Amino acid sequence: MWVYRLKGTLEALDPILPGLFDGGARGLWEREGEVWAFFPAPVDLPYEGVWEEVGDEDWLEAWRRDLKPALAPPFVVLAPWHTWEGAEIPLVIEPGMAFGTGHHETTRLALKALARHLRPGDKVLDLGTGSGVLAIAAEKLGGKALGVDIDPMVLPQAEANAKRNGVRPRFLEGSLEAALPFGPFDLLVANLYAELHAALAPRYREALVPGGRALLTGILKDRAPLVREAMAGAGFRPLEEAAEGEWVLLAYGR
Amino acid sequence: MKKVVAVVKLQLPAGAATPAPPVGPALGQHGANIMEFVKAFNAATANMGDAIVPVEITIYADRSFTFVTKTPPASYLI
Numbered sequence: 018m019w020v021y022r023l024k025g026t027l028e029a030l031d032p033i034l035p036g037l038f039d040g041g042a043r044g045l046w047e048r049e050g051e052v053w054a055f056f057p058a059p060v061d062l063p064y065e066g067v068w069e070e071v072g073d074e075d076w077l078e079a080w081r082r083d084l085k086p087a088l089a090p091p092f093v094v095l096a097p098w099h100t101w102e103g104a105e106i107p108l109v110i111e112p113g114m115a116f117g118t119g120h121h122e123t124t125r126l127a128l129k130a131l132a133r134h135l136r137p138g139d140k141v142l143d144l145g146t147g148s149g150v151l152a153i154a155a156e157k158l159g160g161k162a163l164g165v166d167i168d169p170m171v172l173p174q175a176e177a178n179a180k181r182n183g184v185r186p187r188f189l190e191g192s193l194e195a196a197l198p199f200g201p202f203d204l205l206v207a208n209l210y211a212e213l214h215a216a217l218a219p220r221y222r223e224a225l226v227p228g229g230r231a232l233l234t235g236i237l238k239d240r241a242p243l244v245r246e247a248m249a250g251a252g253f254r255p256l257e258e259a260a261e262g263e264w265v266l267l268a269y270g271r
Numbered sequence: 272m273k274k275v276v277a278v279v280k281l282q283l284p285a286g287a288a289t290p291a292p293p294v295g296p297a298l299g300q301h302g303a304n305i306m307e308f309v310k311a312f313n314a315a316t317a318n319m320g321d322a323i324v325p326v327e328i329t330i331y332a333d334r335s336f337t338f339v340t341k342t343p344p345a346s347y348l349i
């Protein structure tokens with residue numbers, strides 16, 4: 018393939034773009050200060066851009082090569098094409114269009130916290146389930162999971178991921194309110210932002226049986242005081258805190 | 272937290288996304304699933320004939336992504 022590089026943005030170069038397509042352009046890419054127009058071959062053009070030959074790289078094999086298993090003991094989060102030879106519990110998650118591939122600190126902190134607190138047979142609420150990864154991990158640990166999300170687009174993705182893992186959590190559209198008729202739960206895990214945890218703290222109390230656990234992450238280190246304050250006001254007892262990079266997980270007893 | 276690491280702006284012919292450039296390098300740079308985009312974009316634009324489709328791909332910190340397609344550019348339909 019060849020690229021024709023032009024100075025400017027797509028909005029800024031709008032008027033000349035149909036001429037690039039008429040000339041055989043296969044797609045345009047806005048980069049920093051430039052538009053990159055891709056062609057099978059170069060053509061005589063009136064626009065004063067620059068032609069470069071870019072070869073034909075296997076971008077798919079490159080993507081697979083550079084995506085590695087994500088370790089979160091006792092779990093390992095694997096893409097469908099990955100092999101694994103350790104004693105870790107595998108979680109197969111298709112990297113796709115739902116947050117929760119396993120390639121974030123917060124998802125990993127939550128997986129480790131599930132291992133520490135989940136008793137076999139207990140009911141688990143995964144609030145903000147995304148890819149379904151936490152609900153699926155809960156099932157792998159012998160828990161009975163309900164994954165809920167306000168974003169309806171993620172739920173078919175979570176279902177597909179559960180099938181890849183041979184487990185059967187229940188998935189629902191909605192938030193905490195929608196989950197309440199299915200509880201109370203023994204364990205709540207929620208990877209969400211600090212201000213939402215703070216608002217939800219009284220409702221988290223309602224969602225859990227006495228002796229239950231709330232495992233909260235998605236919290237930037239500097240926003241942790243807000244969540245500690247909220248969970249104190251709502252009657253929770255503090256358990257451990259854990260960190261990875263700028264992110265924290267805060268565990269609470271009901 | 273769906274922390275955004277990139278917003279990729281492309282213009283592609285309807286139903287003509289491929290894993291070659293631009294989609295390959297553009298999504299590949301940020302570790303996003305190129306083929307998932309190709310499949311999803313082509314399905315979403317399948318009944319648009321030969322229209323040029325502006326698309327914005329929002330790529331998150333864990334390599335997951337979402338996208339939105341826009342209305343054909345002013346020039347085109349103009």
Ligand SMILES: Nc1ncnc2c1ncn2[C@@H]1O[C@H](CSCC[C@H](N)C(=O)O)[C@@H](O)[C@H]1O
Nearest residue numbers: 116117124145146147166167168191192208
């Ligand atoms: N008020 C709310 N109630 C339920 N889900 C919410 C919510 N606000 C945001 N969400 C969802 O919460 C998810 C957070 S991303 C976390 C995904 C996964 N549990 C993981 O740990 O990686 C997103 O999918 C988002 O749609």
Ligand SMILES: [Cl-]
Nearest residue numbers: 020071292296
């Ligand atoms: Cl390139």
